[PDB]
Symmetry: D3
Subunit: 135 residues, 6 copies
């Protein structure tokens, strides 16, 4: 049983999709090991998006993730990392995400694609340690 980090971004909260997103994870057979609504500091924001520090959008990216509260959660279970990714759908909600996925059913633009899931085992360890220090 692996673990992955799931973030419900500000747009997901503003559109009242917290329960919907969690339900999909629960009915998939995965378990919620940690769940917390909280604000994000620039420090945490910077460290989460470290890999895009040079990129032009980095600026706006940090501004968004700090504009409102987010829901962070540790999802645990068999094939959890890949399962959450399958559930979420590709980055572009119209051209990459299939209908039936979170982004495919509810999103229109890449900027506001509601949720985040760790893209790999290596990535999951880093993200979980970062958001849930000591766990």
């Amino acid at each position: 049983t692996e673990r992955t980090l799931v973030l419900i971004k500000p747009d997901g909260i503003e559109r009242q999709l917290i329960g919907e997103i969690i339900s999909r994870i629960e009915r998939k057979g995965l378990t919620i090991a940690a769940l917390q609504l909280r604000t994000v500091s620039a420090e945490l924001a910077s460290q989460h998006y470290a890999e895009h520090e040079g990129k032009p959008f980095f600026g706006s990216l940090l501004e968004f993730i700090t504009s409102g509260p987010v829901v962070a959660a540790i999802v645990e279970g068999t094939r959890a990392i890949a399962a959450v990714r399958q559930l979420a759908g590709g980055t572009d909600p119209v051209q990459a995400a299939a209908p039936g996925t979170i982004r495919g059913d509810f999103a229109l633009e890449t900027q506001f694609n509601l949720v985040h899931g760790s893209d790999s085992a290596e990535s999951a360890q880093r993200e979980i340690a970062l958001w849930f220090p000591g766990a």
Copy 2:
């Protein structure tokens, strides 16, 4: 922000899927700018299906779109044309439409595939013109 035309065909109405189809459009983040239940003219049917006046089945086509009432609507929003197409699914409900789409979840045959969405920025204007002249 674009606009597209959405038609809920007679089969969609007969199967009581009006609300279901609209809900999917609403939860996707798109807005309903125009909505109307109405009968279709033989005059209007031929103009909407003009690109088939030569083909064989043209007769049965006007017979079906006119056999009962339809719901016409103008869907508006970011990437609306492509989003509605994504939501509806491919023409063949079993071989082309993915599960999770309107056709994939509810239809069996191509003849009765419930809904219609403008295929492009070009036909959207044409179509929105015939069904909603002035808007």
Copy 3:
């Protein structure tokens, strides 16, 4: 086979509950005989809310029903008038509407209780005539 008038007020549209509300009517076994999204003129507002002409909130009632578009529909079927009322729930969404009804599941205040259904056969005949002249 009676008929009743159903209005999805501006708050219902703003909250994207058009499909949800219609689905509930459809799954109840009733049929949508007429459906139209449209703006409300001050004249129509005044005639629809006639019985409240002399009341403190009459001016607010008119201003709300005119602040945005509404969806008007003619619902038809066995016990339609009483059925739509059952589906909608009492006026006060928290103290009168039971969970499971439209107001019970989605509303908080009486001012913004999303929908309207004719309260009687006499009232239905009057409202149908008023919103769908000739129908």
Copy 4:
């Protein structure tokens, strides 16, 4: 605009109803101000259920609420206290809770009735301070 405490008990978590319960609160128009999955210390459960300090069952009560993790949340909005109670339904899921409520749709016994909502303004203050010290 009031605040109330909502607890999703161990049985609610074990049955994978976290998202379902939250969705109902969100669609009702209420907002989640605080959300956290956590274990309950017997020390905290004795203070939360301090009402039954003497009563017989009190022992097994702390054993159950302490047997697994719970989800605590601060629900905020107009008539929030009464709204959450309406949504949850009466204590006895079969004889008091109406269908359409959380207990009415998912529970069978009073012991395992899934959720908790503060019953009043004063009860809410006490509970929120207890579960979310300093807030």
Copy 5:
């Protein structure tokens, strides 16, 4: 742990509500001990509706219950008899059944109220023995 008999009448099957009705029983926490789609003989119909043999609507009752197939099931669990009744709702789908119940959400007339649940323990034993001999 009691048992009760549940019948999904022909109208329930014709309207494609088999899964919906069963889902509600499952999510309530009850278990399906027996499930079978089958036709109803005039003999069995007479025995099932014995209570009404001297009435005017008796013939119509036998004719309807034998007009199509039905789904019979043995539902088992805590307070099963009362729970299934709660779930189904009163006999008159508009005046007695509350929204949120099977009849309240989907039915219009008493004649076609979709489902049946034994009204008591005495009745449960009789009906189960009748539909499921040797169970």
Copy 6:
């Protein structure tokens, strides 16, 4: 108008997805011609899984389909065989099944992928005769 066999395996029953799975078949436009909850004997299991007689997993594959009750059904309708397959999704619920399918939305491992549909016309005849002798 073809026919196919559908099996809801023990894991599907244990997770209370009977109604959900059937609803998806019903809303797709297919009809349930036969439905039965029953236990499976080693004989039937061996006959059914005959294809994998000498494979390393054949042993446990018989132990599972025999560990609990299953729901067998004959689904009938246009393109029924391919439609049920589309609905169910690929064998691997995470890597092959698309979100929106039964396996995609609810399963994690191939061992416990909830349902079975005949993969071909030839296969359907054999399976139906086997599970529903004389029909």
